[PDB]
Design an enzyme around this catalytic site. Structure first.
Site, PDB file in Angstrom:
ATOM      1  N   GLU A 136     -18.190   5.251 -27.241  1.00  0.00           N
ATOM      2  CA  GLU A 136     -17.263   6.248 -26.697  1.00  0.00           C
ATOM      3  C   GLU A 136     -15.863   5.683 -26.521  1.00  0.00           C
ATOM      4  OE1 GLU A 136     -18.952   8.002 -23.253  1.00  0.00           O
ATOM      5  OE2 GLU A 136     -20.047   9.540 -24.365  1.00  0.00           O
ATOM      6  N   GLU A 225     -25.577  11.189 -27.969  1.00  0.00           N
ATOM      7  CA  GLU A 225     -25.699  11.147 -26.525  1.00  0.00           C
ATOM      8  C   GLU A 225     -25.299  12.471 -25.878  1.00  0.00           C
ATOM      9  OE1 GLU A 225     -24.254   7.559 -24.520  1.00  0.00           O
ATOM     10  OE2 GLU A 225     -23.415   8.953 -23.034  1.00  0.00           O
TER      11      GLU A 225
END
Length: 296
Positions: A136, A225
Site C-alpha cells: 500500500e 486486501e
C-alpha cells in the site's frame, strides 16, 4: 486441488486465466503482520482453511517496517514455511512485501530486490506463487508515474530473470485505491495486475466506478486486501455484500483481511480460536462467519 485444476496462471485480455486460457477467480484469506500474528499461519491452519472454508489462495503479509523484515529478517523464514505449505496443499500463495508506514516503496527498494531475487530463485518453477511487491503505497507525494511505476520497473526484472511467467501484483496510490492512474500508464510486463483495496464500511460507488474504468482500459485488478469493517460501527455486512457481488460480476479475485483474533472488527477469529484450525462457528467473529460463507 485448485492448483491441480488450473496450473500456471497468466493474464489474457485483462483477465486472470488458467493454463488452458479459461477464466479463474481466486478467493481466500490474508494473514495479519507475520511478526505479530504468525502463529495462525501453519500447515494445519491453511489445510483447515482449504478443506473447511474452501479457500483457493493464501496471502502472506510480511511487514517491512513496524518490527518487520527490515527490523528483523528472521521473518523471511516464516514466509518460506508458508509457501512450502501452500505447495504441499495445492493452493495459490501471495508473497506480500507489506509496506505501509514506509509509504514510498522506493525507501527499501534495494532490500526488496534482494528479497524477491531470493524468493523467485527458490520457488519460481512452481505455479503456486504470486508476488505482491508493494502492499500500500500512500501519501500525496507518492504517485504512480513518479514513484511506484519506476520502482516496479526495477523489481520486476529481478524476478523475471528467475521466474518469467508468474503473476506480479503491483500496489497503487492512496493505500492502493487509485487503480485509475495505473490504468492510464500501465506496465509493459504482460503478467501483472494492479492492487485494489477497500473497506466495506467506508468505500463507496466512486471506487467501484474507478475500478470499472481501469478494467475498461484493459488493466487486470486483484483485490489483494479488503475488510468488512470501516477503514478507521463493527462490521458492515450489507455494504460488504454489495462489494462481493460487484467482484463476482467482474470475476475479481480477492483476499480478506485478517486471519487473526485481534480485537478489531476485521479480525476473522475470536480470542481462544486454536492457531492450528478446526474452528467452530463459536470461534469465528461476525466477520469470519460472513467471509467463510462467501468463500464456501
Amino acid at each position: 486441488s485448485v492448483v491441480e485444476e488450473h496450473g500456471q496462471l497468466s493474464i489474457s485480455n485483462g483477465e486472470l486465466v488458467n493454463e488452458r486460457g479459461e477464466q479463474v477467480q481466486l478467493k481466500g484469506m490474508s494473514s495479519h503482520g507475520l511478526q505479530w500474528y504468525g502463529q495462525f499461519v501453519n500447515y494445519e491452519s491453511m489445510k483447515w482453511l482449504r478443506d473447511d472454508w474452501g479457500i483457493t489462495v493464501f496471502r502472506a503479509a510480511m511487514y517491512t517496517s513496524s518490527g518487520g523484515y527490515i527490523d528483523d529478517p528472521s521473518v523471511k523464514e516464516k514466509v518460506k514455511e508458508t509457501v512450502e505449505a501452500a505447495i504441499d496443499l495445492g493452493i495459490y500463495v501471495i508473497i506480500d512485501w507489506h509496506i505501509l508506514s514506509d509509504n514510498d516503496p522506493n525507501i527499501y527498494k534495494e532490500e526488496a530486490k534482494d528479497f524477491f531475487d531470493e524468493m523467485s530463485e527458490l520457488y519460481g518453477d512452481y505455479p503456486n506463487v504470486i508476488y505482491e511487491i508493494a502492499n500500500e503505497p500512500n501519501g500525496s507525494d507518492v504517485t504512480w508515474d513518479n514513484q511506484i511505476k519506476p520502482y516496479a520497473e526495477e523489481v520486476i526484472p529481478v524476478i523475471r530473470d528467475n521466474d518469467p511467467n508468474n503473476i506480479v501484483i503491483v500496489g497503487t496510490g492512496t493505500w492502493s485505491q487509485d487503480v485509475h492512474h495505473a490504468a492510464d500508464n500501465q506496465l509493459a510486463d504482460p503478467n501483472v495486475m494492479y492492487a485494489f483495496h477497500f473497506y466495506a464500511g467506508t468505500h463507496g460507488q466512486n471506487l467501484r466506478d474507478q475500478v470499472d474504468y481501469a478494467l475498461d482500459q484493459g488493466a487486470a485488478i486483484f483485490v489483494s486486501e479488503w475488510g468488512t469493517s470501516a477503514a478507521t460501527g463493527g462490521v458492515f455486512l450489507d455494504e460488504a455484500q454489495v462489494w462481493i457481488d460487484f467482484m463476482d460480476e467482474r470475476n475479481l479475485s480477492w483476499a480478506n483481511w485478517s486471519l487473526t483474533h485481534k480485537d478489531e472488527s476485521s479480525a476473522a477469529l475470536m480470542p481462544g480460536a486454536n492457531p492450528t484450525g478446526g474452528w467452530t462457528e463459536a470461534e469465528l467473529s461476525p466477520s469470519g462467519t460472513f467471509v467463510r460463507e462467501k468463500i464456501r
